[PDB]
């Protein structure tokens, strides 16, 4: 129930792997963020140097955060579209970490991937809509913002607009056409809430990859798991701990290291390497290598 039992034989990658191949581990939820797509050429926000916050000087905006806030987008969409042009990859190639999740799906272990990313790489790796909660939406589709229109446009249309440097307008009514992303200030999709209500009732492992767990309400997903569900973080830095200050005012933060630690494991490094290591323990390494090479070769030949 709400008891804090220890189901990992040890708080290591090796322990997680053994658990994953026990009968108790049938339903895995992945929570992922921008860290899983940095090796695919898309910057995160927070990384020193290569993160976007460091690299937004030219846009002459108040504080680097505004270009992804809904009120600033409403005032002027042009900076956002300009940056989208700058960031739009020539080629969409999912990472090892993406294909690791594809392996979970093919093995019948994936209950859901909840992603904060908007880059569509989960879809390209072969996660289906069913499998996915795009908690912050997606560039995959776009919609005219006009309540009485709401015409849908595909990414090839939006891409053309973004590269032509033409602010996207609706062909039916000439209102702005906006990528289906959730800007800061916006409500998350209803899907997010209903999947969360059901999925966290019966999850056996939470795998958390490439996110700082600072964006809410996404971050609070870690507290929705049962207290005995193991949680593995694969990330360059620890994340999701309780802050010693905020934590003094009235969910289960990550606890990898304290005296009371019983189910949380942190593997610090590149997501691609951590997933590769985990795959190796599970005996999936060659499968993973073959999938990535074949999928990448297939993309390379488009």
């Amino acid at each position: 129930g709400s008891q804090k039992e220890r189901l990992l034989d040890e708080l290591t990658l090796e322990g997680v792997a053994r658990y994953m191949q026990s009968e108790r581990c049938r339903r895995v939820i992945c929570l992922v963020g921008a860290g899983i797509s940095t090796s695919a050429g898309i910057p995160d926000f927070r990384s020193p140097s290569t993160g976007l916050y460091d690299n937004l000087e030219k846009y002459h905006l108040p504080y680097p955060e505004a270009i992804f806030e809904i009120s600033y987008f409403k005032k002027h969409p042009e900076p956002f579209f300009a940056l989208a042009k700058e960031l739009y990859p020539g080629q969409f190639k999912p990472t090892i970490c993406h294909y690791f999740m594809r392996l979970l799906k093919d093995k019948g272990l994936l209950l859901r991937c909840y992603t904060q990313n908007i880059d569509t790489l989960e879809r390209i790796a072969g996660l289906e809509q069913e499998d996915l909660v795009e908690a912050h939406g997606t560039f995959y589709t776009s919609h005219c913002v006009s309540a009485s229109c709401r015409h849908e446009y595909p990414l090839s249309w939006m891409k053309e607009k973004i590269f032509s440097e033409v602010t996207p307008k609706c062909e039916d009514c000439q209102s702005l056409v906006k990528p289906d992303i959730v800007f800061f200030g916006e409500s998350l999709p209803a899907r997010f809430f209903s999947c969360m209500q059901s999925d966290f009732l019966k999850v056996d492992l939470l795998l958390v990859m490439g996110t700082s767990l600072q964006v809410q309400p996404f971050a609070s997903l870690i507290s929705k798991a049962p207290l005995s569900t193991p949680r593995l973080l694969i990330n360059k830095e620890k994340a999701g701990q309780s802050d010693p200050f905020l934590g003094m005012i009235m969910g289960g933060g990550m606890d990898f290291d304290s005296k009371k630690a019983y189910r949380d494991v942190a593997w610090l490094g590149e997501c691609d390497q951590g997933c590769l290591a985990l795959a190796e323990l599970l005996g999936w390494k060659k499968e993973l290598e073959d999938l990535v090479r074949r999928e990448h070769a297939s993309i390379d030949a488009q």
Binding site: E65, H136, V182, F183, F184, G185, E186, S187, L188, Q214, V215, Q216, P217, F218, A219, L246
Partner: peptide
Amino acid sequence: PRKQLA
């Protein structure tokens, strides 16, 4: 609730 930093 709304997308937001903490």
